[PDB]
């Protein structure tokens, strides 16, 4: 049993950075999978990066290769969505799920332990 909230959004130039972070409360931070979603209005919600209890690399959306890092510190309960060379394609809302590292899914969508999301907007308007 696990309860997740994420930190870290707002509202930022194009090309920009931000680094989501999703703060685990619950026994055992280390058996849990962890992912990263978001959701666009009107859109379905999309997996963007997941990261495992084992040494192996973490998986990546094709739509953030390479600008994105997914991290996870265990002593800190908190796994972090480091988010590089940001596009308005980018805006969402960013969620974090958990699930137990033995259990088997067939979509992110079948994680049992979600966040209420941060939201992301990325604007090329120079309001910066």
């Known amino acids: 049993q696990v309860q997740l909230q994420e930190s870290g959004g707002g509202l930022v130039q194009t090309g920009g950075s931000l680094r989501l972070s999703c703060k685990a409360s619950?026994?055992?931070?280390?058996?849990?999978?962890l992912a990263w979603s978001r959701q666009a209005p009107g859109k379905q919600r999309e997996f963007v990066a997941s990261?495992?209890?084992?040494?192996?690399?973490?998986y990546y959306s094709g739509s953030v290769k390479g600008r994105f890092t997914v991290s996870r510190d265990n002593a800190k309960e908190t796994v972090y969505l480091q988010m590089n060379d940001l596009k308005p394609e980018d805006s969402a809302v960013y969620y974090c799920?958990?699930?137990?590292?033995?259990?088997?899914?067939?979509?992110?969508?079948?994680?049992?332990?979600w966040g209420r999301g941060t939201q992301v907007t990325v604007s090329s308007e120079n309001l910066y």
């Open positions: 619950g026994r055992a931070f280390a058996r849990y999978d």
């Open positions: 990261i495992g209890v084992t040494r192996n690399p973490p």
């Open positions: 799920a958990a699930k137990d590292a033995s259990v088997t899914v067939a979509t992110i969508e079948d994680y049992p332990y």
